[PDB]
Enzyme design. Sequence first.
Site, PDB file in Angstrom:
ATOM      1  CG  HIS A   1      -5.572  -2.680   0.454  1.00  0.00           C
ATOM      2  ND1 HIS A   1      -4.847  -2.680  -0.450  1.00  0.00           N
ATOM      3  CD2 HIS A   1      -5.077  -1.716   1.491  1.00  0.00           C
ATOM      4  CE1 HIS A   1      -3.903  -1.505  -0.310  1.00  0.00           C
ATOM      5  NE2 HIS A   1      -4.153  -1.258   0.969  1.00  0.00           N
TER       6      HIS A   1
ATOM      7  CD  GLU B   1      -5.125  -4.488  -3.634  1.00  0.00           C
ATOM      8  OE1 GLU B   1      -5.503  -3.831  -2.534  1.00  0.00           O
ATOM      9  OE2 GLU B   1      -4.200  -4.891  -4.365  1.00  0.00           O
TER      10      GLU B   1
ATOM     11  CB  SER C   1      -1.064  -0.334   1.121  1.00  0.00           C
ATOM     12  OG  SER C   1      -1.984   0.958   0.835  1.00  0.00           O
TER      13      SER C   1
END
Length: 496
Positions: free
Chosen positions: A415, A319, A185
């Site tokens: 995610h 995600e 990320s």
Amino acid sequence: MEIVIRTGSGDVRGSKENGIAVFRGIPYAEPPVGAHRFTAPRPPRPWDGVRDATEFSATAPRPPYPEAIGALLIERFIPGDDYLTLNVWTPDPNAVGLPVMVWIHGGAFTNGSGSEPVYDGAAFARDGVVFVSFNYRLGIIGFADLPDAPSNRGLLDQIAALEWVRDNIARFGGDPGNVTVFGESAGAMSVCTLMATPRARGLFRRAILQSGAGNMAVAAEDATTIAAVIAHRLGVEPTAAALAHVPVAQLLDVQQQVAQEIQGAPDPAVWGERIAGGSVLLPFAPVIDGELLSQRPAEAIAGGAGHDVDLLFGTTTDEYRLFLAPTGLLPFITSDYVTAHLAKSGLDADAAKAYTAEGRGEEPGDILASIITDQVFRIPALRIAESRVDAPARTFGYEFAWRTPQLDGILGACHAVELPFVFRTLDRAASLVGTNPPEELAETVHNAWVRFATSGDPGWPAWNPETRSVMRFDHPVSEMVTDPYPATRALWDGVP
């Protein structure tokens, strides 16, 4: 059990923990207190004798995660001011030339730390890799742009930590010439930023991008607006000279409110038309300041930045479900909202049908999550890979497809889900992955990361635009796939 190694600022005392030598909280920069919140990182005041490096240091000031996110992503805060430190796991400081992996944590540039339990380096050291994690400045302190402070302190901190590795890691058994930087990320976005930053020259041979690419940067004019709003709400001028004196709790309160406003629908009367129209994705991402970072990382990479660095990249299948699904509100999203969202990118309403045809959502909320996954993560990652078609270094890709069972499975392969598999820390990440995740998959993923750091090849065919081949990780089966989701991919060919 004690083990004393010489650094650049003096001797440090770590501990031998079961054939592994561990060092926690080695300072790489002086405490960024007061005016030094905003100055370039300063190398630590050298010391005689032995400084203890057995415990993790303080972590950087951060607000809590939003409630829904924070139940899944449980952070460990450590109090104090001396937080610009790093941690090293090595099987033996006397080893010759081991691969070195340097982790840059994620957290939207406002959250995270190097020392979160899920980022434990022991499984890498057990496999013959020297592992380094570290904290960098976050939020306003790390990234708010001010006319009287160097831009992007948090990026400068990442550079300083990587320079520490270059200058010290051989004393911990590592080859400074075989450094793989990796992150997830905001950490992966940071890696892409470092590829586009001249000041980071030569600090890593390889890179692993987990769910982050080169799109997450704030235009200088938007950063100026953000700092002006922050300062107005604090009743001070938008300068480091003023913000150096603001109690940190007040800084974090305004920071968290800015984050909330930019993530939703910013009022144009407060934020101007650009920001109200979505020109800022994350408001404390690195600023395109012009000197340290001259252009958005994606464009630098398209022009050759990082093409000498071996690359492993990937995303999770679902995600953006992390951000839209966990409170049960996805079923309320409407087709007309999805159509309006597609129109912001210049796409027609029938683009939603391509998502449905590829099994990426029947209901509008599911389709929206897949669209945003593509816009924020998948397409930016593929654009970097495509840019590297003629790069001298190698490129490999993955898709992490294993779905977490939390909340009746509503998150899918959301995610952050790959994190404990990479680190073999599944028992530390149950809030996100549930009680009984497959250790076999952690072995598979972690071993591929070790192989990539070791040799620049994770053990499967390289990515190219011909077959667009990626390793699709799942349990019980992980296997190669070619050009997954091609019709939804093609939708984005001409999008700004």
